Coordinates of C-alpha atoms in Angstrom, one line a residue:
Chain A
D23 CA -56.8 18.2 240.9
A24 CA -55.6 15.0 242.6
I25 CA -57.7 11.8 242.2
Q26 CA -59.4 10.3 245.4
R27 CA -62.5 8.6 243.6
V28 CA -62.0 5.7 241.3
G29 CA -64.4 3.3 239.5
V30 CA -63.6 0.0 238.1
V31 CA -66.0 -1.8 235.5
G32 CA -65.2 -5.7 235.4
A33 CA -64.2 -8.1 238.1
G34 CA -62.0 -10.7 236.3
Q35 CA -58.4 -11.3 237.3
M36 CA -57.4 -7.7 235.9
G37 CA -60.3 -5.7 237.2
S38 CA -59.9 -7.3 240.7
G39 CA -56.1 -6.5 240.7
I40 CA -56.8 -2.9 239.8
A41 CA -59.4 -2.4 242.4
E42 CA -57.1 -4.1 245.1
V43 CA -54.0 -1.9 244.3
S44 CA -56.2 1.2 244.4
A45 CA -57.9 0.3 247.8
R46 CA -54.4 -0.6 249.2
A47 CA -53.0 2.9 248.2
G48 CA -55.8 4.6 250.2
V49 CA -58.4 5.6 247.4
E50 CA -62.3 5.1 247.5
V51 CA -63.1 2.4 244.9
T52 CA -66.5 1.6 243.6
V53 CA -66.6 -1.7 241.4
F54 CA -69.4 -2.1 238.8
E55 CA -70.9 -5.3 237.2
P56 CA -74.3 -5.8 235.7
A57 CA -75.1 -8.9 238.0
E58 CA -74.9 -9.9 241.5
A59 CA -73.1 -13.2 240.5
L60 CA -70.2 -11.3 238.9
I61 CA -70.0 -8.8 241.9
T62 CA -69.5 -11.7 244.4
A63 CA -66.9 -13.5 242.2
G64 CA -65.0 -10.2 242.0
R65 CA -65.2 -9.6 246.1
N66 CA -64.1 -13.2 246.5
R67 CA -60.9 -12.8 244.3
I68 CA -59.9 -9.6 246.4
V69 CA -60.6 -11.3 249.8
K70 CA -58.4 -14.4 248.6
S71 CA -55.7 -12.2 247.3
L72 CA -55.6 -10.1 250.4
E73 CA -55.7 -13.3 252.7
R74 CA -52.6 -14.8 250.8
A75 CA -50.7 -11.3 251.3
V76 CA -51.5 -11.5 255.1
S77 CA -50.5 -15.2 255.3
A78 CA -47.1 -14.0 253.6
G79 CA -46.5 -11.0 256.1
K80 CA -46.8 -8.3 253.3
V81 CA -49.9 -6.6 254.6
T82 CA -51.2 -6.4 258.4
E83 CA -54.5 -7.6 259.3
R84 CA -55.6 -3.9 260.0
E85 CA -54.3 -3.0 256.4
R86 CA -56.5 -5.8 255.0
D87 CA -59.5 -4.5 256.7
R88 CA -59.0 -0.8 255.7
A89 CA -58.5 -1.9 252.1
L90 CA -61.9 -3.7 252.3
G91 CA -63.5 -0.8 254.1
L92 CA -62.7 1.4 251.0
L93 CA -64.2 -1.1 248.4
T94 CA -67.9 -0.5 247.3
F95 CA -69.7 -3.0 245.1
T96 CA -72.7 -2.1 243.0
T97 CA -74.9 -3.2 240.0
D98 CA -76.2 0.3 239.5
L99 CA -74.1 2.3 236.9
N100 CA -75.5 5.7 238.3
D101 CA -73.2 5.0 241.4
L102 CA -70.2 5.8 239.3
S103 CA -71.6 9.4 238.6
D104 CA -69.3 10.9 241.0
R105 CA -65.9 9.2 239.9
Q106 CA -62.8 11.1 238.8
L107 CA -61.1 8.0 237.1
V108 CA -62.9 5.0 235.7
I109 CA -61.0 2.0 234.5
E110 CA -62.7 -0.7 232.3
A111 CA -61.3 -4.1 232.3
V112 CA -64.2 -6.5 230.6
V113 CA -64.0 -9.0 227.8
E114 CA -61.9 -8.1 224.8
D115 CA -65.2 -7.4 222.5
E116 CA -65.3 -4.1 220.5
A117 CA -69.2 -3.9 220.7
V118 CA -69.4 -4.6 224.5
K119 CA -66.6 -1.9 225.1
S120 CA -68.4 0.6 222.9
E121 CA -71.8 0.3 224.8
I122 CA -69.9 0.6 228.2
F123 CA -68.1 3.8 227.2
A124 CA -71.2 5.3 225.8
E125 CA -73.1 4.9 229.0
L126 CA -70.0 5.9 231.1
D127 CA -69.7 9.0 229.1
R128 CA -73.4 9.9 230.0
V129 CA -73.2 9.0 233.7
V130 CA -69.8 10.4 234.7
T131 CA -70.4 14.1 234.4
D132 CA -67.3 15.9 236.2
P133 CA -65.6 17.4 233.1
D134 CA -62.2 16.8 234.7
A135 CA -63.0 13.0 234.8
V136 CA -60.9 10.3 232.9
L137 CA -62.4 7.3 231.1
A138 CA -59.6 4.6 230.7
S139 CA -59.5 1.2 228.9
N140 CA -57.3 -1.7 230.1
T141 CA -57.5 -3.3 226.7
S142 CA -54.6 -5.1 224.8
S143 CA -56.4 -5.6 221.6
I144 CA -59.1 -3.0 220.6
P145 CA -57.7 0.3 219.4
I146 CA -58.2 3.1 222.0
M147 CA -59.6 5.6 219.3
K148 CA -62.4 3.1 218.7
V149 CA -63.7 3.3 222.3
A150 CA -63.1 6.9 222.5
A151 CA -65.3 7.3 219.4
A152 CA -68.1 5.9 221.2
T153 CA -68.4 8.8 223.6
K154 CA -69.7 12.4 223.0
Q155 CA -66.4 13.8 224.7
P156 CA -63.7 11.7 223.5
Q157 CA -60.9 13.9 224.8
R158 CA -61.6 12.4 228.2
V159 CA -60.7 8.8 227.0
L160 CA -57.1 6.9 227.0
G161 CA -55.5 3.7 227.6
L162 CA -54.3 2.7 231.0
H163 CA -52.7 -0.7 230.5
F164 CA -51.6 -2.9 233.7
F165 CA -49.9 -6.2 234.0
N166 CA -50.8 -9.3 236.0
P167 CA -50.2 -9.5 238.9
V168 CA -51.2 -6.1 239.4
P169 CA -50.5 -5.6 243.0
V170 CA -46.8 -6.6 242.3
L171 CA -45.8 -5.5 238.9
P172 CA -44.7 -1.8 239.1
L173 CA -45.6 -0.8 235.6
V174 CA -48.5 1.0 233.4
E175 CA -48.6 2.0 230.0
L176 CA -50.3 5.4 229.4
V177 CA -51.7 5.5 225.7
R178 CA -52.7 8.8 224.3
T179 CA -55.2 8.8 221.1
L180 CA -55.3 11.5 218.4
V181 CA -57.6 13.5 220.6
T182 CA -56.9 12.7 224.4
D183 CA -56.6 16.0 226.3
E184 CA -53.2 16.8 227.7
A185 CA -54.3 17.7 231.0
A186 CA -56.3 14.4 231.5
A187 CA -53.1 12.5 230.6
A188 CA -51.1 14.5 233.2
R189 CA -53.7 13.8 236.0
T190 CA -53.8 10.1 235.1
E191 CA -49.7 9.9 235.1
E192 CA -49.6 11.7 238.5
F193 CA -52.2 9.3 239.9
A194 CA -50.3 6.1 238.7
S195 CA -46.9 7.4 240.0
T196 CA -47.6 9.1 243.2
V197 CA -50.7 7.0 244.5
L198 CA -50.3 3.5 243.0
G199 CA -46.4 3.9 243.1
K200 CA -46.0 2.5 239.4
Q201 CA -43.7 3.4 236.7
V202 CA -45.4 5.1 233.7
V203 CA -44.5 4.3 230.1
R204 CA -45.9 6.6 227.2
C205 CA -46.8 5.5 223.7
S206 CA -49.1 5.9 220.6
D207 CA -52.1 4.1 219.9
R208 CA -50.7 1.1 217.9
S209 CA -51.6 -2.8 218.4
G210 CA -49.5 -4.2 221.3
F211 CA -48.2 -0.8 222.5
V212 CA -44.6 -1.5 223.9
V213 CA -44.5 -4.5 226.1
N214 CA -46.8 -6.9 224.2
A215 CA -45.5 -5.8 220.8
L216 CA -41.8 -6.8 221.9
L217 CA -43.0 -9.8 223.9
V218 CA -45.5 -11.7 221.7
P219 CA -43.3 -11.9 218.5
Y220 CA -40.4 -13.2 220.6
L221 CA -42.6 -16.0 222.1
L222 CA -44.0 -16.8 218.6
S223 CA -40.4 -17.4 217.3
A224 CA -39.8 -19.8 220.2
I225 CA -42.8 -21.7 219.3
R226 CA -41.6 -21.9 215.6
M227 CA -38.3 -23.3 216.7
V228 CA -40.0 -26.0 218.7
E229 CA -42.5 -26.8 215.8
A230 CA -39.7 -27.3 213.4
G231 CA -37.9 -29.8 215.6
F232 CA -34.8 -27.4 215.8
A233 CA -34.6 -27.8 219.7
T234 CA -36.8 -29.2 222.5
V235 CA -39.0 -27.2 224.7
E236 CA -36.6 -27.9 227.7
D237 CA -33.6 -26.7 225.9
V238 CA -35.0 -23.6 224.5
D239 CA -36.2 -22.6 228.1
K240 CA -32.8 -23.6 229.6
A241 CA -30.8 -21.5 226.9
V242 CA -32.9 -18.5 227.7
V243 CA -32.8 -18.6 231.6
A244 CA -29.0 -19.3 231.7
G245 CA -27.8 -17.3 228.7
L246 CA -30.1 -14.2 228.9
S247 CA -30.9 -14.4 232.7
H248 CA -34.6 -14.2 232.3
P249 CA -36.5 -15.5 235.4
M250 CA -38.6 -17.8 233.0
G251 CA -38.1 -19.2 229.5
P252 CA -40.6 -18.4 226.7
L253 CA -42.5 -21.6 226.5
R254 CA -43.0 -21.7 230.3
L255 CA -43.9 -18.1 230.0
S256 CA -46.4 -18.7 227.1
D257 CA -48.1 -21.2 229.4
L258 CA -48.4 -18.6 232.1
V259 CA -49.9 -15.9 229.6
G260 CA -52.3 -18.4 228.3
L261 CA -52.1 -19.8 224.7
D262 CA -55.6 -18.5 223.7
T263 CA -54.6 -14.8 225.1
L264 CA -51.3 -15.1 223.0
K265 CA -53.2 -16.3 219.7
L266 CA -55.6 -13.3 220.1
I267 CA -52.8 -10.6 220.5
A268 CA -50.9 -12.3 217.6
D269 CA -54.2 -12.2 215.4
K270 CA -54.6 -8.4 216.2
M271 CA -51.0 -7.7 215.5
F272 CA -51.1 -9.5 212.1
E273 CA -54.4 -7.5 211.2
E274 CA -52.8 -4.3 212.0
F275 CA -49.2 -4.7 210.6
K276 CA -49.6 -7.5 207.9
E277 CA -46.1 -8.9 208.3
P278 CA -46.1 -12.9 208.7
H279 CA -43.8 -13.0 211.8
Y280 CA -46.6 -11.6 213.8
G281 CA -49.0 -14.4 212.9
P282 CA -49.7 -17.4 215.0
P283 CA -47.8 -20.5 214.1
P284 CA -49.6 -23.7 213.2
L285 CA -48.6 -25.5 216.4
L286 CA -50.2 -22.7 218.5
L287 CA -53.5 -22.9 216.6
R288 CA -53.5 -26.8 217.0
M289 CA -53.0 -26.5 220.8
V290 CA -55.7 -23.8 221.2
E291 CA -58.2 -25.9 219.3
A292 CA -57.4 -28.8 221.4
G293 CA -58.0 -26.7 224.7
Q294 CA -54.4 -26.9 225.7
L295 CA -54.2 -23.4 226.9
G296 CA -51.3 -23.6 229.5
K297 CA -51.4 -23.4 233.3
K298 CA -55.0 -22.5 233.5
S299 CA -56.3 -25.6 231.5
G300 CA -53.7 -28.1 233.0
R301 CA -51.5 -28.3 230.1
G302 CA -49.7 -26.3 227.2
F303 CA -46.0 -26.8 226.4
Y304 CA -45.9 -28.4 230.0
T305 CA -48.1 -30.4 232.3
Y306 CA -49.5 -28.7 235.4
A307 CA -50.9 -31.1 238.3
Chain B
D23 CA -12.6 -40.8 227.5
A24 CA -12.0 -37.8 229.8
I25 CA -10.5 -34.3 228.9
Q26 CA -7.5 -33.0 230.9
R27 CA -5.6 -31.1 228.2
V28 CA -7.3 -28.1 226.4
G29 CA -6.0 -25.6 223.7
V30 CA -7.5 -22.1 223.1
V31 CA -6.7 -20.4 219.8
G32 CA -7.0 -16.4 220.2
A33 CA -6.8 -14.4 223.5
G34 CA -9.2 -11.6 222.8
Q35 CA -12.3 -11.1 225.2
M36 CA -14.0 -14.5 224.5
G37 CA -10.8 -16.6 224.2
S38 CA -9.3 -15.1 227.6
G39 CA -12.8 -16.0 229.1
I40 CA -12.6 -19.5 227.9
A41 CA -9.0 -20.2 229.0
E42 CA -9.9 -18.6 232.5
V43 CA -12.9 -20.9 233.1
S44 CA -10.9 -24.0 232.1
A45 CA -7.9 -23.3 234.2
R46 CA -10.1 -22.5 237.3
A47 CA -11.9 -25.8 236.7
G48 CA -8.5 -27.5 237.1
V49 CA -7.6 -28.4 233.5
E50 CA -4.3 -27.9 231.7
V51 CA -4.6 -25.0 229.0
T52 CA -2.3 -23.8 226.2
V53 CA -3.2 -20.2 224.7
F54 CA -1.9 -19.7 221.1
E55 CA -1.7 -16.3 219.3
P56 CA 0.8 -15.8 216.5
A57 CA 2.2 -12.5 217.7
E58 CA 4.1 -11.9 221.3
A59 CA 2.2 -8.6 221.7
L60 CA -1.2 -10.4 221.4
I61 CA 0.1 -12.9 224.1
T62 CA 0.9 -10.1 226.8
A63 CA -2.6 -8.6 226.1
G64 CA -4.3 -12.0 227.0
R65 CA -2.4 -12.8 230.2
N66 CA -3.1 -9.4 231.5
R67 CA -7.0 -9.8 230.6
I68 CA -6.8 -13.0 232.6
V69 CA -4.8 -11.7 235.6
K70 CA -7.0 -8.5 235.9
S71 CA -10.0 -10.6 235.8
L72 CA -8.7 -13.2 238.4
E73 CA -7.7 -10.1 240.6
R74 CA -11.2 -8.4 240.1
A75 CA -12.5 -11.7 241.3
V76 CA -10.4 -12.1 244.5
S77 CA -11.2 -8.5 245.1
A78 CA -15.0 -9.1 245.5
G79 CA -14.4 -12.4 247.6
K80 CA -14.9 -14.9 244.8
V81 CA -11.7 -17.1 244.9
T82 CA -9.0 -18.4 247.6
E83 CA -5.6 -16.5 247.2
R84 CA -3.7 -19.8 246.1
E85 CA -6.8 -20.9 243.8
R86 CA -5.8 -17.7 241.6
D87 CA -2.2 -19.0 241.4
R88 CA -3.4 -22.8 240.9
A89 CA -5.4 -21.3 237.9
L90 CA -2.3 -19.2 236.9
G91 CA -0.2 -22.3 237.3
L92 CA -2.4 -24.2 234.7
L93 CA -1.9 -21.7 232.0
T94 CA 0.8 -21.8 229.3
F95 CA 1.1 -19.2 226.4
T96 CA 2.8 -20.0 223.1
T97 CA 3.4 -18.5 219.6
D98 CA 4.0 -21.9 218.1
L99 CA 1.0 -23.7 217.0
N100 CA 2.8 -27.1 217.1
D101 CA 2.6 -27.0 221.0
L102 CA -1.1 -27.8 220.5
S103 CA -0.3 -31.4 219.3
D104 CA -1.2 -33.2 222.4
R105 CA -4.5 -31.3 223.1
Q106 CA -7.8 -33.5 223.6
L107 CA -10.0 -30.3 222.9
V108 CA -9.0 -27.1 221.0
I109 CA -11.3 -24.2 221.0
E110 CA -11.0 -21.4 218.3
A111 CA -12.2 -17.8 219.2
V112 CA -10.5 -15.5 216.7
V113 CA -11.8 -12.7 214.4
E114 CA -15.2 -13.4 212.5
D115 CA -13.8 -13.9 209.2
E116 CA -14.3 -17.1 207.0
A117 CA -11.0 -17.2 205.3
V118 CA -8.8 -16.6 208.6
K119 CA -10.9 -19.5 210.4
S120 CA -10.4 -21.8 207.3
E121 CA -6.5 -21.3 207.5
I122 CA -6.5 -22.0 211.2
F123 CA -8.6 -25.1 211.1
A124 CA -6.6 -26.6 208.3
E125 CA -3.4 -26.2 210.2
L126 CA -5.0 -27.4 213.5
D127 CA -6.3 -30.6 211.6
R128 CA -2.7 -31.2 210.6
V129 CA -1.0 -30.6 213.9
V130 CA -3.4 -32.3 216.3
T131 CA -3.0 -36.1 215.5
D132 CA -5.2 -38.0 218.0
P133 CA -8.4 -39.1 215.9
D134 CA -10.5 -38.8 219.2
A135 CA -9.5 -35.2 219.6
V136 CA -12.3 -32.3 219.0
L137 CA -11.8 -29.2 217.2
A138 CA -14.5 -26.6 218.2
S139 CA -15.3 -23.0 216.9
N140 CA -16.9 -20.2 219.1
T141 CA -18.2 -18.5 216.0
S142 CA -21.6 -16.7 215.8
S143 CA -21.4 -15.6 212.2
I144 CA -19.9 -18.5 210.0
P145 CA -21.5 -21.9 209.4
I146 CA -19.8 -24.7 211.2
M147 CA -19.9 -27.0 208.1
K148 CA -17.6 -24.2 206.3
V149 CA -14.9 -24.4 208.8
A150 CA -15.2 -28.3 209.1
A151 CA -14.9 -28.5 205.1
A152 CA -11.4 -26.9 205.6
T153 CA -10.0 -30.0 207.4
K154 CA -9.3 -33.6 206.1
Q155 CA -11.3 -35.2 209.1
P156 CA -14.6 -33.2 209.2
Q157 CA -16.1 -35.6 211.8
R158 CA -13.8 -34.1 214.5
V159 CA -15.3 -30.7 214.0
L160 CA -18.3 -29.0 215.9
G161 CA -19.5 -25.7 217.4
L162 CA -18.9 -24.8 221.2
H163 CA -20.4 -21.4 221.5
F164 CA -19.9 -19.5 225.0
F165 CA -21.4 -16.3 226.3
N166 CA -19.8 -13.3 227.8
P167 CA -18.8 -13.1 230.7
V168 CA -17.7 -16.7 230.3
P169 CA -16.8 -17.1 234.1
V170 CA -20.4 -16.1 234.9
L171 CA -23.0 -17.0 232.4
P172 CA -23.4 -21.1 232.9
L173 CA -24.4 -22.0 229.3
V174 CA -22.7 -23.4 226.1
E175 CA -24.5 -24.2 222.8
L176 CA -23.2 -27.4 221.3
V177 CA -23.6 -27.4 217.5
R178 CA -23.3 -30.5 215.4
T179 CA -22.9 -30.3 211.7
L180 CA -24.2 -32.9 209.1
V181 CA -21.1 -35.1 209.7
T182 CA -19.8 -34.3 213.3
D183 CA -19.0 -37.7 214.9
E184 CA -21.5 -38.9 217.8
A185 CA -18.4 -39.7 220.1
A186 CA -17.0 -36.3 219.6
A187 CA -20.2 -34.5 220.5
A188 CA -20.7 -36.7 223.7
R189 CA -17.2 -36.1 224.9
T190 CA -17.5 -32.4 224.5
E191 CA -21.0 -32.4 226.3
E192 CA -19.4 -34.4 229.2
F193 CA -16.5 -31.8 229.4
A194 CA -18.8 -28.8 229.4
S195 CA -21.2 -30.2 232.1
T196 CA -18.9 -32.3 234.4
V197 CA -15.7 -30.0 234.4
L198 CA -16.8 -26.4 233.5
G199 CA -20.2 -26.7 235.4
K200 CA -22.2 -25.4 232.4
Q201 CA -25.7 -26.3 231.0
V202 CA -25.5 -27.6 227.6
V203 CA -27.9 -26.9 224.8
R204 CA -28.0 -28.7 221.6
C205 CA -29.0 -27.5 218.2
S206 CA -28.4 -27.9 214.3
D207 CA -26.2 -25.8 212.1
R208 CA -28.4 -22.7 211.3
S209 CA -27.5 -18.9 211.6
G210 CA -28.0 -17.6 215.1
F211 CA -28.3 -21.1 216.9
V212 CA -30.8 -20.9 219.6
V213 CA -30.0 -17.8 221.8
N214 CA -28.9 -15.3 219.2
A215 CA -31.8 -16.4 217.0
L216 CA -34.2 -15.4 219.6
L217 CA -32.3 -12.3 221.1
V218 CA -31.3 -10.4 218.0
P219 CA -34.7 -10.1 216.2
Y220 CA -36.1 -8.9 219.6
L221 CA -33.2 -6.2 219.9
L222 CA -33.8 -5.1 216.3
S223 CA -37.5 -4.6 216.9
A224 CA -36.7 -2.3 220.0
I225 CA -34.5 -0.2 217.8
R226 CA -37.2 0.2 215.1
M227 CA -39.4 1.5 217.9
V228 CA -37.0 4.1 218.8
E229 CA -36.1 5.1 215.2
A230 CA -39.9 5.7 214.4
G231 CA -40.3 7.8 217.5
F232 CA -43.0 5.4 218.8
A233 CA -41.4 5.5 222.4
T234 CA -38.1 6.8 223.9
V235 CA -35.0 4.7 224.6
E236 CA -35.6 5.2 228.5
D237 CA -39.3 4.2 228.3
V238 CA -38.6 1.1 226.1
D239 CA -35.9 0.1 228.7
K240 CA -38.1 0.9 231.6
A241 CA -41.1 -1.2 230.2
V242 CA -38.9 -4.2 229.7
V243 CA -37.1 -4.3 233.1
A244 CA -40.5 -3.5 235.2
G245 CA -43.0 -5.4 232.8
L246 CA -40.9 -8.6 231.9
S247 CA -38.6 -8.5 235.0
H248 CA -35.3 -8.7 232.6
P249 CA -32.3 -7.4 234.3
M250 CA -31.7 -5.2 231.5
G251 CA -33.8 -3.6 228.7
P252 CA -33.1 -4.1 224.9
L253 CA -31.1 -0.8 224.2
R254 CA -28.9 -1.1 227.3
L255 CA -28.3 -4.5 226.2
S256 CA -27.5 -3.7 222.6
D257 CA -24.9 -1.2 223.8
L258 CA -23.3 -4.1 225.9
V259 CA -23.3 -6.7 223.0
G260 CA -21.8 -4.2 220.7
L261 CA -23.7 -2.6 217.7
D262 CA -21.1 -3.8 215.3
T263 CA -21.6 -7.3 216.7
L264 CA -25.5 -6.9 216.5
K265 CA -25.2 -5.6 212.8
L266 CA -23.0 -8.7 211.8
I267 CA -25.3 -11.2 213.2
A268 CA -28.5 -9.6 211.7
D269 CA -26.6 -9.4 208.3
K270 CA -26.0 -13.3 208.4
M271 CA -29.4 -14.1 209.7
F272 CA -30.9 -12.1 206.7
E273 CA -28.4 -13.7 204.2
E274 CA -29.6 -17.2 205.6
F275 CA -33.3 -16.8 205.9
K276 CA -34.2 -13.6 203.7
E277 CA -37.0 -12.4 205.9
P278 CA -36.8 -8.6 206.3
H279 CA -37.4 -8.4 210.1
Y280 CA -33.8 -10.2 210.5
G281 CA -32.1 -7.4 208.6
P282 CA -30.5 -4.4 210.5
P283 CA -32.5 -1.1 210.4
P284 CA -31.2 2.0 209.1
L285 CA -30.7 3.7 212.6
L286 CA -28.5 0.7 213.5
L287 CA -26.4 1.2 210.2
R288 CA -25.9 4.8 210.8
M289 CA -24.8 4.3 214.3
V290 CA -22.2 1.8 213.2
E291 CA -21.0 3.9 210.3
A292 CA -20.6 6.7 212.8
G293 CA -18.4 4.5 215.2
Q294 CA -21.2 4.7 217.9
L295 CA -20.7 0.9 218.9
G296 CA -22.0 1.0 222.4
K297 CA -20.1 0.6 225.8
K298 CA -16.9 -0.2 224.1
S299 CA -16.6 3.2 222.2
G300 CA -18.3 5.3 224.8
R301 CA -21.6 5.9 222.9
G302 CA -24.5 3.9 221.6
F303 CA -28.2 4.4 222.8
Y304 CA -26.6 5.7 225.9
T305 CA -23.3 7.7 226.8
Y306 CA -20.5 5.9 229.0
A307 CA -17.8 8.1 230.9

C-alpha cells in the first residue's frame, strides 16, 4: 500500500530537489542518470543544498547524514526495478521523455507502481502512450525550491488508474507534507496557466513604454502584497523557461495573449535570460 | 509649494479611507457630501476605523483625537474654496463626476490648486474636459484599505500641468508616506490592468470544472506565496466592481480575455457580490 521505495530520473535543479525532499522525509531513494558525470553533478547539488540547510539551523548534522544515507546513485536502469514510485525530471523534449517511459515501463514490474512526470510543457497522455500499461502514468508537478514550497499538482490523464492517483496523493500529503492540487491534462495545469499570462502582460506594459520596470514591480508589491513584482519574478523563473511555456500555451489554446511578446523574444535571443545569466529586466553581480 | 489644506468629496468606504489617512498625517481635511445623512455615515466609518485601530495597539489615545480634531464635515461645497488639493471618490458614473468637477473648478479659485479623481472606470480626460482649467486635473488612485496599502497611482492626462503632478507626488510621498507609481490615462492604469485579467482567468477555470474554487486558491497561496488566492480576492474586491472594470477594459481594448465570463455575469445578476452581500465564491456568516 504505502510508498517506501522512490526512484528519480534526472539530477538537474528539480530532480535534485525531489530526491532531497524524499530522503529528508525518510524514504529510500535511487537516483538514475545515464552517465557518471551527471550522477556526480546531482550528488553535489544535494550535498551543497543540505550543507546550506545545516549552516542556517533548519536541519541537524545527524539529519543531513541520515538523508545522505538513504540516497543511492546509479547508471544502471535495472536498479529501479523494485521502485513503487518513479519521478522523471529530465530535459523538456518529447522524444527523450517517450524513450525513458518505454524503458521504465519494462523495468519497473510491480503492478501497483506509479510512473510520474514533472513536465510543465509535454502533455501527460503523450508520455503515458509510450508505455504498455498507460493506467500507471500521471503528472506530479513540483515547484523550485522543492524542499521549501509546500505544493504539488497531481494531473490525471484520460486513463490514469484511480488507485494509482490515490496512492500518489497520500504519499505527497502524508510523507512529503505537501498540499495536493488536482487538475486535468491541459497545457500549464493550474499554477503556470495563471502565472505566465500575468507575467507576459507585465512585459507588454514595459515594452510599450507605459510604465518602467521599477514602477510595475513597485505597484505590484505595495498594491497587491506579492513578495516580488512580475519582472523580478520573470528574471527568477528564467526568460528562456518563460518563452517555452508561453510557446506551448499558444500552441494548445491559440489565443494571442498566451504568445511571447517581441521584447521577451529579443532578450532570449541576446542571451539575457535573467538571474542565471547575469541579466534580464535587472542586472545581477 | 506644500499642501496643508485637503478636501475630500464623498464619504463611502474609499473617501472615508482617504480622509482618515490625511488627518492622521496631520493635514486639515474638509469632507463634503450633499445630504446630512451621508455625513453621519462617514464620521462613524472613521471613528469605528480609528477605534478598531486603537483596539489593536496602532495609535496613541490623543493621536486619535488629534486626527478627529483635523476633520470637518460640510454639506456646502463652497467651504472647499480654500483647498490646495481636492480628491473626489463618489459613485462611478460619468454624468455625476462631470457635474461635481464643473462646480469644483468654479469654487476652487487658486490656479496652483489640484483637482484629483479616485475613479477606476472613467477616463481622467473626460472629467477634466468638464472644467475650464483642465491642466489642474489628474488621477490619484488609492487602494482599500487606504490606511494600510502604501501605494497611489498618479495618472496624468494629455494636458495635466507638470507643476500640478510634481506637487501631488510630493504630497503622497512626503505627507502620506505612500509609494507613487506614474502612468498614462488608459483603462485599468497599472494595478487593475494586471490584477483583473488574472482574476477573470481563475473564474473561467472554475466555470469549466477544470479545478475547484478551493484547489485554485490553495495552489496560488502555496505555489506563488500570495496572501490570498484569486477567488477569495474576487469576493473581497466585490464581483460588481470586478464586472465594471472588466466591461470598461473590454470597451477600451476589445480583446475577449478582458470581458467578464458568463459565470461572473450570472453571479452579479443574482446579487452574489462577495463578502459585502454574504456570498460569492465563498459564504460569509
